Design a protein around this ligand. Structure first.
Ligand code: Q9A
Ligand code: Q9A
Lengths: 410, 410, 410, 410
């Protein structure tokens, strides 16, 4: 009995040889991308043999196993439908239907307050999926870079807890949400900000990351860390946006100085500096696709699904999904956790970084925001998703009414 | 082949005939209780043939088949380790350790608010587990009756969504927590109570159940409902507590009038009569055991696990688990939601109604309260549980560090 | 020299005999009403004399002195222009224009929450003046009985602090205003209602008066007190208003319950009767004329200006004038102090009971209210009054611009 | 007849010639100060004849003529007991008693957040009186200089309203006290600061004085005013304090940024520059004596009582006294208006600028502050002072019980 030869027949169709193309589409339909980091060695040995014998391009039992043995455990789970969503082909057809269903939601205003977002077209709309198993799908403008803005807040929160610990970080920032008209306060009853998803707390989380090092290396570190999360897909920086967020954050200066007077930063902080760090962190660039991996890294206990590398300690990822669930969507967090149940984070550029724990992570992007600050199509999507799929945090996996369960076969 | 036959060998140990007590001990080790209502036909036949043959006592292939023909589906998956917690014996040893660690935390004051909760001894402490499959276990003072008090708030809420739907019920009561010092207000900004787990929201929810009918038939309605949730285990009513909780609820009368003034009850409400129904529902008795089935019903999408009967819509069990999450523990709901992640509701008798969605329902009961209103041992047990098992709503099922996962074998 | 005779010459104007009306007119143009209690002996000896010798009807040095001697100090001051307003004849002209400019101010809604405030016409409008010397003037509808409503709040607080003293009284009630979105709260952080001009605090004041006797004598005591405050002018009761005010005070009961549960009342209170007692007090009836005398007892150190009797301790009248300055116009209290700078109390029936300390008291009444609860005309007239005369509480009495002073002669 | 002639006999006491020192002691017992700027011609001419005839030194009716013609009117009101306080020598014995009674109240903490306030001894304690007529008295450390700090707030508010009128000024700053625990919020519901006596309201006012000019001139403009209000007595400036005030003013900067974001300043407002100018205005020095004349200009309709000069518009002085009464004493403002009922303003250096309209103004200085911000001896002195005299805003000038009234005689 042999792992590679068995798989060779399950694709062989009883035929004596396997065309190369007939393998590459058989792969793409499990949800995997040929470019997958975990797959390169199987792909390099396809790049190899596609010059040696140009008179093929068939694969022996030998030649197949020549390419596939390095990555056979993960190749077999794909082909025996062990992936978390087994029939991935159907599910993306629903992601597409759900996409077009939101793509018609024309209302909302593009953030005007800096020119770099006022220049983005309200017509843009991309949705990118990434499972805890690397199965990927995209619809729309999913390769257009845009800023995280406050989609970075849980990411840097995860970074800080990962390095310093729950208990150190939660001397400096609370861990609840404030109250639907405690929106305007900075500090709770203990003179910490209310949670790391609000600007008072985020500006505080930022002063914890990589202390004793200067602000340009601090940035490189967070760039390094965000890189491991998206498994080395697009992570960028628009100096443009950064300039406008610098000239115009009289509010964050207001918050910052209140925090300084009231003694909430760690001993030896240079407040005005980390306002600059914080402005930088918000002008970090992502695509739909690359962030959906960051999102799937949270969905997977802190292990990147396209690389398998442990990026975040399981304490940081739990902590974060806990605070996305209740402080994640500005004043809509309450109604959002009720009707959707998924930890999410929004951003004024139009981002919505979505986790479905133990299934997949997402990124949805339409620049027009509603009157509370959330992507109009973004919100309309997440509702439609939970509507359709028993992905609500407090659905029941065994008795789930008429909703569809993508983890199940038939 | 034949199911009963195959199960027969699974227990036969290659022998020709199984002793009854061998069959019994094999059944109870799966955590099933022989008293199970899904098993009554199995037991009714064993009890009868161990009459019609004092000649024994020993079942042959065809004699064991007469007994288990009727409950075979459930007997098989009990023996084929197909329950949610497959190693139920090892899990209950864990519960006993957690219980016995909670049991050394003698802090807290019991509720002397009325002569009936001050009558309960501080040394009482009990935990009842009922899984979504029916596997019971308890240790401690698990058969003492105590009033639900505010542990009934999610139960009554669930019934009102179950009968009226989400839209109707949430015309009358909000969805979100209130804010760690908006605990003294009744209404939120739309002049609705903040959510169904606060006194003012519970009362308004009460005025939605089974309108037009007198308070007697209302009460019967809610009890015949609460019986189906507990699989017809103990659901009682204390009159001693009801008479106290009416001569001494000045503040619910305070809330009751503020609500009428602000036009929060449905048209044709009798406000004082509904305070009475309110005082009543709080005086309903459960034991630890009867209530762990109640919680278990919400852990199971609305189906009572020990009877298989559908007690609540999935839409009402979802809403209840969402609002228990965030608003379920008075002023500790934020800290609980962070450090525990399970839907939970607390009373002043010393109850804590616990749900692990898709796993089990629990009910812990120690009378003495901490300064926030919560059973001291209860809160200790619930932290101890989540540190041990990956049940925190935001643990990963795949990567979970030092924690045991009782959903798995080895 | 002699005091009766000198006076007699002053009004004689050198001629041998004074007619009867020529005196009565000379007396009225000082603003004393011929029916002043302190002139009875005089007016009596005048109605005696005006039957004896019908062949006059004129007096001489001897016979004038026969009538005026008993009342010669008061008659003289009036006639040597010693009264606080020397030229009271022009002052009432200005009070007429002020009344005409206000009856032009046609807006506002008459209170309709009960059928007894809604029956009144929106064109009823009256002002009544009464000085620290008893000079009287009225224009409009000043003898129409109407209901004090929250105008009674200072009058009972005065009775309260008169009988037991500032210190005792303020163990149950704060002494500031609360803040312009603190109006729905009942208690400050000491768990006392914020001041006696709010319904939370009024209700608590009410519990303090004549404790230990029943609600009939209690009301009688207050009635007797209010008689002495108005020099026995019209005071009454609307059993009509009191009935529909008790069937509708759901908030008032809401308050009463809250204060009970928070133990805001003195030992041995029957809360539900204090609300009955309080409802009654809010239906005490007055006219513009009678009530402006109550305000004149407040302007005058506690002595009723038309009887001479001490009715309130100079301690109680200060504390009340204090808390009408800051708390007496509901949410318009802040603006009203700023601009009018006079202590007033408004109530929902359309009355404004206004003090100009050390000068005069008023009552303005016109039932159409505005969107903070104040008589529209009554408000307008108040601004106009202080735009005219240096009566504003922080006006200079020596360097006061083009403002007009009725206390100065020329 | 001639004014100097008869004023001569009132001092002559029959004799042919008045000793000059006799005349002076008669003139100082009216509480006039021989330095008084309205008496300068008289004191020059006394010295000149004390030169031109050592031959003496005693004034016949004709040489006394030669000296007092210049300032005769002021001198006669002073010698004919026509001043606001006729018996000034008695009053000052009282002011000493109360001063000596506060001197025993040794509690509090000297403000030490900067080293220029910790520099002052806690046993420093001064009071200085100046009437509307320029009668003077001081006892204690009344020539020591100290910074106004928040005492400057009403002085600049008055400047801005005098220069701009009420309506314009109150576009940028409301006019009510916030509410006894909305002390941390910066703005009221209209996004204006609460009033001109809170650190945020003071700041925006500062932005309205003399817009369009640099800070050096703006300061020169403001100190022009102050010198006039104190009759050109000591007005100075601690640059040592302005330095420490700006280096430590994190919350003031926190405030300044917040106000810029909510567009609270006039267009074209340099926010950091307005902040500098704010720290300057707070570092302006006075002594008890010089600052008692500031206060007195407010008691006096805007006229400086010792120069006769018009400094502030009656509209400006009204609004400032109104806002001092309700907002001037930090969180003590509610209780201070109740129990003292005088327009007063405290500061962190220990001063309390105090006013009795139509009588006098004061400055009580003692560096130790209480837990609310107020001089321990200052608050003590004002309580004692008004228990003694009928100066409480709502005392009666006719029936004032056993209080002394320094405005009458026998
Ligand atoms: C928009 C909105 O929220 N309106 C309202 N919602 N709820 C309310 N409750 C009122 C009844 C009891 N409440 C008090 N609670 N605490 C109090 N005293 C202190 C010191 O806090 S009074 C006020 S008013
Ligand atoms: C209607 C309106 O204007 N509301 C507001 N006014 N000002 C605001 N700005 C915030 C910045 C400083 N503030 C804080 N003060 N205290 C805090 N912490 C605690 C425990 O209270 S945060 C408030 S929001």
């Amino acid at each position: 009995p042999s792992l590679e030869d068995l798989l060779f027949y399950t694709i062989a169709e009883g035929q004596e040889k396997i065309p190369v193309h007939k393998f590459i589409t058989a792969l793409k339909s499990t949800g995997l991308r040929t470019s997958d980091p975990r797959l390169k060695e199987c792909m390099d040995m396809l790049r190899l043999t596609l010059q040696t014998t140009s008179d093929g391009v068939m694969l022996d039992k030998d030649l197949f196993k020549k390419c596939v043995q390095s990555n056979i455990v993960l190749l077999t789970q794909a082909f025996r439908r062990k992936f978390v969503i087994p029939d991935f082909m159907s599910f993306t057809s629903h992601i597409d239907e759900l996409y077009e269903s939101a793509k018609k939601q024309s209302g909302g205003k593009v953030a005007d307050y800096i020119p770099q977002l006022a220049k983005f077209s309200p017509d843009l709309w991309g949705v990118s999926v990434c499972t805890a198993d690397g199965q990927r799908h995209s619809t729309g403008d999913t390769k257009v870079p845009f800023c995280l803005q406050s989609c970075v807040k849980p990411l840097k929160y995860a970074i800080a807890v990962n390095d310093l610990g729950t208990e150190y970080v939660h001397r400096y920032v609370g861990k609840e949400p404030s109250g639907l008209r405690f929106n305007k306060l900075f500090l709770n009853e203990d003179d910490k900000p209310h949670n790391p998803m609000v600007n008072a707390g985020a500006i505080v989380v930022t002063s914890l990351i990589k202390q004793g090092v200067n602000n340009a290396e601090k940035f490189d570190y967070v760039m390094q860390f965000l890189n491991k999360m998206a498994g080395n897909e697009y992570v960028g920086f628009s100096n443009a946006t950064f300039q406008s967020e610098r000239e115009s954050g009289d509010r964050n200066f207001a918050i910052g100085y209140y925090l300084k007077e009231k003694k909430c930063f760690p001993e030896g902080t240079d407040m005005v500096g980390i306002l600059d760090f914080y402005f930088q962190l918000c002008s970090i660039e992502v695509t739909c696709e690359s962030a959906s991996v960051m999102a799937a890294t949270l969905a997977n206990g802190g292990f990147c699904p396209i690389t398998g590398e442990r990026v975040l300690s399981p304490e940081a990822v739990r902590n974060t999904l806990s605070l996305m669930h209740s402080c994640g969507m500005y004043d809509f967090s309450g109604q959002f956790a009720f009707h959707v149940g998924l930890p999410a984070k929004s951003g004024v550029a139009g981002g919505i970084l979505l986790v479905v724990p133990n299934v997949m992570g997402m990124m949805c992007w339409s620049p027009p925001l509603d009157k509370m600050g959330n992507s109009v199509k973004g919100i309309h999507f997440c509702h439609d998703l939970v509507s359709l799929c028993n992905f609500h945090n407090y659905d029941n996996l065994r008795h789930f009414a008429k909703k569809l369960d993508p983890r199940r076969e038939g």
